Design a protein around this nucleic acid. Structure first.
Ligand SMILES: O=c1[nH]c(=O)n([C@H]2C[C@H](O)[C@@H](COP(=O)(O)OP(=O)(O)OP(=O)(O)O)O2)cc1-c1cc2cc(F)ccc2o1
Ligand SMILES: [Mg+2]
Length: 540
DNA sequence: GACCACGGCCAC
DNA sequence: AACAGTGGCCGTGGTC
């Protein structure tokens, strides 16, 4: 409907657009349109009509702003109805769902998408009248952030391609050595990547005992948790775990990332998805740069392929024990506050208990293990499972979990307060009022209910940490531009910046402090910073 | 070619 | 595998 009016559109219209593909840095702009009033404007030529707009306002605004930066046009994103819906309910994650929940249909034509962004904005902005805290998250965090992420997306990161090509051939020859040493240990060749075939070999032809089953189809599981408990029980299980790590890293990172360098930028560009998680975290895709390996030695080799441009340095900043400090603030547990008001490290302490060694002896491989253990226990891992992780008695793990929550008694009072409040209001909230609707808290099936409970009390603390990080990013981005530095990646509690060599020390010291004082809590936020030519040695 | 479900596994 | 939570991508095995 509306009324075809001649392009250009008046100021502050709502833009709709169609891309050749979902990735803004790689897409052709097929159609461009705008609407304000009862008028829909359609562009004769989309790439020239981008010159006319002063701001991107509408569904998926960040995406068009990214494509604009790719053509050297500073066109910042503004209002996006997706961002309002996502603050109303974080299950509002795609425009198909949002339009089919607030009064329209998400089609494939720019004009119709423009007019939809106009009405979708009116509706949701009305639904947020009086939700002053969500209106605060919108004006102060989420809408500014979409601009920051647009500049991150369009900048990209430099990758050592020749090095990854070379690493590919090396890993390939090693995969072949393990494959053959499994085909032999099994008396024949089969597809080692087919989990079904491997099931028959491990559990039928050989004699190994099936520890567990898969969720949907009830097959015998060949997961690492299962195979780890079948080590020494046969050497072939050890080789399969080696083969699995290598083909994972090769087919997910080593091989596809080099072929994704952009021809204009010479760099690698991810997408930061702003309305994609239930807790408020960002996500990253196409490629996901938030899960580049690091823990294993081959993984470290891959993390080193992410490097600074000629004449710059990477600066890496990572909040320490972030969800535990948030937890101390949220609960008000005094003993836990006192841990951080005294610079204690709960991952290195759990690691010394867990390995026997003195605190001065825990090395990175050990601390990493205690991180997963501590966060495992915190969010409700069963005694029985912990006893299988730590290889201890069951009543020994019950005490580890009773000692853990006894040294900080006020936490369980907060878990319970959080749950009871969620049953009454239907949602739980972070420190700034970001909310997750958790309807299954009154479920009558125990398993469905207790899962709802674990998602329910995790969200306030993980979404508070993500709120801090996002706010730090909007406070830091303007200061980095003064110094001529840039933001590259965010990995949940961590930032990577690129800075000129003769300014790196300055941007590190600065960025460290903006992050630490983003929002004073009842506990000091520490940050670790490092500088290097590559992502790995930046992280000290 | 394009989707999809599933088990599996990388990061935080 | 499971009474830890949050993501996204892979190959396999299908269907259309
Ligand atoms: O299993 C987990 N479950 C979970 O819920 N998280 C959340 C809570 C954290 O606060 C937050 C930030 O992760 P993080 O930065 O790595 O942890 P942290 O800030 O507490 O520690 P430090 O920076 O001081 O080393 O992710 C993290 C982990 C986890 C285990 C682990 C092992 C590694 F080898 C490397 C990274 C790891 O992540
Ligand atoms: Mg951290």
């Amino acid at each position: 409907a509306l009324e075809e009016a001649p392009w250009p559109p008046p100021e502050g219209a709502f833009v709709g657009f169609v891309l050749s593909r979902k990735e803004p840095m790689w897409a052709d702009l097929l159609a461009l349109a705008a609407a304000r009033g009862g008028r829909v404007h359609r562009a004769p030529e989309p790439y020239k009509a981008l010159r006319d707009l002063k701001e991107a306002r509408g569904l998926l605004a960040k995406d068009l702003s990214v494509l604009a930066l790719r053509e050297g046009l500073g066109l910042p994103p503004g209002d996006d109805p997706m961002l309002l819906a996502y603050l109303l309910d974080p299950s509002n994650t795609t425009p198909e769902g949002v339009a089919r929940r607030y009064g329209g249909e998400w089609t494939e034509e720019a004009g119709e998408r423009a007019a939809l962004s106009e009405r979708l904005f009116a509706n949701l902005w009305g639904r947020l009248e009086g939700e002053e805290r969500l209106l605060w998250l919108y004006r102060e965090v989420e809408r500014p952030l979409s601009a920051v992420l647009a500049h991150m997306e369009a900048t990209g990161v430099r990758l050592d391609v020749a090095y990854l090509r070379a690493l590919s051939l090396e890993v390939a020859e090693e995969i072949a050595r393990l494959e053959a040493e499994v085909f032999r240990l099994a008396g024949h060749p089969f597809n080692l990547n087919s989990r079904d075939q491997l099931e028959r070999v491990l559990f039928d032809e050989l004699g190994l005992p099936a520890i567990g089953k898969t969720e949907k189809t009830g097959k015998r599981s060949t997961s690492a948790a299962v195979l780890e408990a079948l080590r020494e029980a046969h050497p072939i299980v050890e080789k399969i775990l080696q083969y699995r790590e290598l083909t994972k890293l090769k087919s997910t990172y080593i091989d596809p990332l080099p072929d994704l360098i952009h021809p204009r930028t010479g760099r690698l560009h991810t997408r930061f998805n702003q309305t994609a998680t239930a807790t408020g975290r960002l996500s990253s895709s196409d490629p996901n740069l938030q899960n580049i390996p690091v823990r294993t030695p081959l993984g470290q080799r891959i993390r080193r392929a992410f490097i600074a441009e000629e004449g710059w340095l990477l600066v890496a900043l990572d909040y320490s024990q972030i969800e535990l400090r948030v937890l101390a603030h949220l609960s008000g547990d005094e003993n836990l506050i006192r841990v951080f008001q005294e610079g204690r490290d709960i991952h290195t302490e759990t690691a010394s208990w867990m390995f026997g060694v003195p605190r001065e002896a825990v090395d990175p491989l050990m601390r990493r293990a205690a991180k997963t253990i501590n966060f495992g226990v915190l969010y409700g891992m069963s005694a029985h499972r912990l006893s299988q992780e730590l290889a201890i008695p069951y009543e020994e793990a019950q005490a580890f979990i009773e000692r853990y929550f006894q040294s900080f008694p006020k936490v369980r009072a907060w878990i319970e307060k959080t749950l009871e409040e969620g049953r009454r209001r239907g949602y739980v909230e972070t420190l700034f009022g970001r909310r997750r609707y958790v309807p299954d808290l009154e479920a009558r099936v125990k398993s469905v209910r207790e899962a709802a409970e674990r998602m329910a009390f995790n969200m306030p603390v993980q979404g508070t940490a993500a709120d801090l990080m996002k706010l730090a990013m909007v406070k830091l981005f303007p200061r980095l531009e003064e110094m001529g530095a840039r933001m590259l990646l965010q990995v949940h509690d961590e930032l990577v910046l690129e800075a000129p060599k003769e300014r790196a020390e300055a941007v590190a010291r600065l960025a460290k402090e903006v992050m630490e004082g983003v929002y004073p809590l009842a506990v000091p936020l520490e940050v670790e910073v490092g500088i290097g030519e590559d992502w790995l040695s930046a992280k000290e």
